[PDB]
Structure 1
Amino acid sequence: GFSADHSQIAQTKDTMFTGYLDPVQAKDYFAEAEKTSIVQRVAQKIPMG
């Protein structure tokens, strides 16, 4: 190819552009499901004070 700021040819690699052309934010495609208590599904609920 050419070096990072090759003096004849402008490229997206060139330091002069840094802050333009950033990668865009995306949602977390790999998030866990938020897990929840198993004992609350099997043990009898009772009122308490």
Structure 2
Amino acid sequence: GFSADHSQIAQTKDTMFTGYLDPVQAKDYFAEAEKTSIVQRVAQKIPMG
């Protein structure tokens, strides 16, 4: 159970490995399902030009 940059043991905590341990990128999981308009859910949709 050791410091980062300990003199005898190599760890992923150590500053010498900076930039080799890059996270994977992912979707915005904290976004809710996208807000459609509520009037369009109750009013009648019709053909238009």
Deviation at 1:23, TM superposition (A): 2.0
Deviation at 1:28, TM superposition (A): 2.4
Instruction: Determine helix, strand or coil for the equivalent of 1:41.
Output: helix
- Runs (4+) of structure 1 exceeding 6 A deviation are 46-49
Instruction: Say if 1:3 and 1:33 are closer, same or farther in 2 by CA, change over 3 A.
Output: same
**Corresponding pairs, count:** 49
Instruction: Determine helix, strand or coil for the equivalent of 2:48.
Output: coil
RMSD of aligned alpha carbons: 2.4
Q: Which runs of 5+ in 1 are unaligned?
A: none
The two structures have a TM-score, normalised by structure 1, of: 0.66
Deviation at 1:29, TM superposition (A): 2.7
The two structures have a TM-score, normalised by structure 2, of: 0.66
Q: Which runs of 5+ in 2 are unaligned?
A: none
Q: Which moved more, 1:25-34 or 1:11-20?
A: 25-34
Distance 2:20 2:4 in 1: 16
